[PDB]
Amino acid sequence: YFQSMETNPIPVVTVQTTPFDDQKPGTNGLRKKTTVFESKKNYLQNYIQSVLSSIDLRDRQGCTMVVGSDGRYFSRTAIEVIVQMAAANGIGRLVIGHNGILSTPAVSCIIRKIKAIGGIILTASRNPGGPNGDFGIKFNVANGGPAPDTVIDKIHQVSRTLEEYAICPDMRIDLSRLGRQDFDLENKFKPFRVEIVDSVEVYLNLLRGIFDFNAIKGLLTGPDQLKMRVDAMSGVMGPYVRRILCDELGAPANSAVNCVPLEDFGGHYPDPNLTYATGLVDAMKGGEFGFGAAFDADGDRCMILGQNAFFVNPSDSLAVVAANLSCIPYFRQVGVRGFARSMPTSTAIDRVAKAMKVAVYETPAGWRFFGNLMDSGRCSFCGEESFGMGSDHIREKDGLWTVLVWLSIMAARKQGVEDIVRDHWTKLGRNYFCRFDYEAIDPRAAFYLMKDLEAVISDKAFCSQKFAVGNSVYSVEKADNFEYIDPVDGTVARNQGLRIIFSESSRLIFRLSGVGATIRIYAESFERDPERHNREPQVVLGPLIAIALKISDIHERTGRRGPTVIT
Ligand SMILES: [Ca+2]
Ligand code: NA
Ligand code: NA
Ligand code: NA
Ligand code: NA
Ligand code: NI
């Protein structure tokens, strides 16, 4: 028994609604066109309710949730609705970033730091922002990582059947002022608490214990200072770059580019790659900078560029960092438990894992599966070919972490980006790698393309086949439709990519990702000869690409005669 006082209690409102059929989140949350969440009636409310209902009402009552966004248009409105419906659903406290700004890694860090039950991240990553752009809602769980396939099924089940939802429509929240905002609610004893927190502080504190900030600051300052351009692409990472790389680590202000978060990302796709980070590439090509980097909208993906815009392939970045973790105080003290990569990612890191005698895991695309490997201590470091890298310091990929680990390696090795990569190739060989994206193709054609290709590579005699393109020859070693049985919780992921492994240390992978679908073709060829480590990837891999387009017959089936994007 307890007694207390209230003043002007905010009422709770129940609303009759109708379920939607498509409110199941994908691998990176539920993404729709912004107008769907903004104007389709009760669409936003239905999904927030379903997300909150996926938490046991006894664990839910009096719990804490973290909320953050990448800053895109509509984020503030979604946050307000989220606050009004968390209050109405018995949530004890919300920790929200200043101005609604929290990077995906920061959310993951804060969830774990304060032992929250989970968090909602409002981001559509690389996809454009604005009224006619895209909007997404990610849900992370208590370990700070993406929701497992089991919680997704729960969220879906509730969304299909949701008949009502609860909300406090009269509640208003000010995201601009740091500090606590308590609310007396009808039928709630304890006041409902909203903490507006600095977007960067707690996340920065985590990094300060991981890295040697003195070594990094020495690299960025002094007469022999690294000249550097870091482009947050007008997304969430702006304040993180300024507060951490400039203020704390001493980088000059002109190193921070597009570091004002914008609701439309400045009218550009917040996608860190050679195709869309054209401003960074043009600056790096001038030859004036020894290090470049771009982040995506929510700050978990990162492109690394060397002097003269030397492109560090994400699969090479993974292997290079894995081979130099000893340069980092964190890993010197806690050790390296194991590595993990998504199956489409190049096998470069596998060669590092072999030399170091550490386990390497091969997972489906998506960070969901790295989390169990980290939670169980099987893995300490992992990454994906899609510009993603991370460690067990959180349960999300981390772009700024990727920059700091690279700077730490450069400072400790007294070398630039290109020399580190080329030395790495000399030591272990080079895994030539590229990815073709065929975007927004007829999902009907995509279906039959994969169905037919799966039948081809599954034929009994396919392992006895060999292919010739010009003077090059490739002999099928094994081929399958990739499957992953989670070694921790037993989750089974089927149809995770068609894979052809050739005898001549080469691979082809086919993955099927609005209405349209995306087919991704990955090609990999290993080169041991150190004198053949400066060929153009499209030349080395041309033959394998030709095989891919032929056996898949993608150009005919889709009417395209070329990929949309090449990485
Ligand atoms: Ca064979
Ligand atoms: Na994300
Ligand atoms: Na994305
Ligand atoms: Na508090
Ligand atoms: Na991919
Ligand atoms: Ni992202």
Numbering used by the authors: -4 to -1, 1 to 509, 514 to 567
Paper text:
We here present crystal structures of herring PGM5, the first structures of this protein from any species. As expected, all four domains contribute to the active site with one loop per domain; loop 1 (residues 119–126), loop 2 (residues 292–297), loop 3 (residues 379–384), and loop 4 (residues 507–520).
Furthermore, we have solved the structure of the most common PGM5 variants found in the Baltic and Atlantic herring (bPGM5 and aPGM5), differing by only one amino acid substitution (Ala330Val), and explore the possible functional significance of the mutation. The bPGM5 protein reproducibly crystallized as block-shaped crystals in space group P21212, where part of the His6-tag is ordered. Interestingly, Val330 is involved in a crystal contact in bPGM5, but the corresponding interface is not formed in the structure of aPGM5. An additional crystal contact is made between the N-terminus and the ordered part of the His6-tag, while in aPGM5 the N-terminus is involved in a less extensive crystal contact. Thus, crystal packing shows that Val330 contributes to a protein–protein interaction surface in crystals of bPGM5 that is not observed with Ala330 in the crystals of aPGM5.
